[PDB]
Amino acid sequence: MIKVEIKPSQAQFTTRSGVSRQGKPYSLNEQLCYVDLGNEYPVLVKITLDEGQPAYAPGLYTVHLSSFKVGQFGSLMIDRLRLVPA
Template sequence: MIKIEIKPSQVDVTERSGEKNGKKWSSREQHGYIYNGGDYPALFLFRLQDGQPPYAAGFYELVESSIEVGEFKRLTFSRSFALRPIQNNKA
């Protein structure tokens, strides 16, 4: 299980937009901490889908479909990044 923590200060969403090659784009992002076996969890940024509310503060696990094999057989996060609350949220 890959554990993610969203702290109360991280429930805000960062929104960006722009234009590239004549096409408009927008991105919604939220911060969290990922527990990856180190001494401390690492701060990272993940995308939210259009219209998706931000994740509330608490502990989550990464949904399996959030990881895919990308170019050159490297693991990447999919565009449909999703988290599942950990039972009783006291991890």
């Protein structure tokens, strides 16, 4: 299991916006977190949230299976990092 932590300072999201190729508006909410990749300290990672989802509260989390998909060359990829409480 991957250990992910939302620190107290990372409890909010920011929103970027724009317009798709054929005219539709979009909004993307982004939140920061720390992921332990086994180096001397955890590293900073950006998360893009799913539609209608609030910012994750501060705490410890692991990665849900729905984060992964098979990509166009047949290898596994991350779609969006989706978290669940540890």
